[PDB]
Symmetry: C3
């Protein structure tokens, strides 16, 4: 399966309709932080490790990533424009005893590998816990993406 069809499959599996947010400069796309919202309605709200568990937090990370990918696909028409996801910053709304930030971020990284593949899905990342996020969201993720020239 190619990148755009794989995207469609992940979108159907999650059960959401995903189809300034992004600025392009010098072959790079800078993307605003994305919370797990669709239309407006924030989809996974709460504090990870208290009222949100690890599985749900990974889901939230997946949704934020799919939103970013949808924004790219809408702006450029196809995910074939992605050369590399250079950087992914994951901010997790959690308790002060939660230590599984890597596993939560794996929920986003897996989406990248599933849609972009072994090589193009490679990315650097940072994962930290914050004490709150916009509209009580549980995860927020931003990206810098290299675009194919």
């Amino acid at each position: 399966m190619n990148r755009d069809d794989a995207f469609l499959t992940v979108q159907a599996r999650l059960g959401y309709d995903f189809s300034t947010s992004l600025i392009e400069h010098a072959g790079l796309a800078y993307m605003s932080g994305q919370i797990p919202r669709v239309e407006d309605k924030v989809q996974v709200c709460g504090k990870v490790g208290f009222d949100v568990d690890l599985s749900q937090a990974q889901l939230a990370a997946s949704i934020s990533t799919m939103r970013a990918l949808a924004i790219l696909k809408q702006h450029y028409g196809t995910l074939q424009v992605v050369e590399k996801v250079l950087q992914m910053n994951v901010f997790i709304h959690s308790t002060a005893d939660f230590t599984q930030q890597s596993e939560v971020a794996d929920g986003a990284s897996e989406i990248l590998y599933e849609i972009l593949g072994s090589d193009t899905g490679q990315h650097t990342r940072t994962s930290v816990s914050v004490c709150q996020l916009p509209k009580n969201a549980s995860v927020e993720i931003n990206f810098i993406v290299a675009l194919k020239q």
Copy 2:
């Protein structure tokens, strides 16, 4: 048109003078990377405390405005004029808040609005991220960093 006079006007409206182990700004390949700015002006961090506890939404928006004006003053000092700005590529807003504060977007609007008023809706467009942190240098309420594309 006249971004520098607009900057001076915001400085007058806010009532602070901005024309007063790391580096504030580094340029590479036509981009200026800027260090995180807390609201320090005329010495003294201006709006200290925890948003949603001893700092309210309006004061937090002011704090965001001050951090942004600080960044613009640094740009004006390095490049002589805000006409050097092609685009604010990225603005990261870190808000020192309580665990029930969910209006991070409204706090960040205090910075974004300054960018739009001074630079215009075109050169003022920017991506942004706004998250709550549990503390900041010198008990500051907001800290903001930037990546700015430069003209020519």
Copy 3:
């Protein structure tokens, strides 16, 4: 004499051996993006805990130093030598701390000093952001990421 010798000297001074699903470093257009580094060396996240509670300022500075040395070791492994570094464009420092900790700048100085000691006051110049977070992977006390310009 050069930066690699300085790295070995600082490594001896610190007393850890650094030569021993994401990617640590990706290069694009002459920039190396680096993942956030917690103070992991000799298969132990070193230090760990909440700064201002069970980690004091000195230990947090050591943690910041270890994360920085890790980043430098990754660059040296990828490129064979630290002579490829032109500038550390950006260093973001996230500190696991209490809600009363306000010395984030002093913690980040532990990283900045490593950069200056190994790379020099010129190549070691960097912009920086330092904020407190409420937790980190594996209960770590500091996590640091980097954007580094390469000489070309």
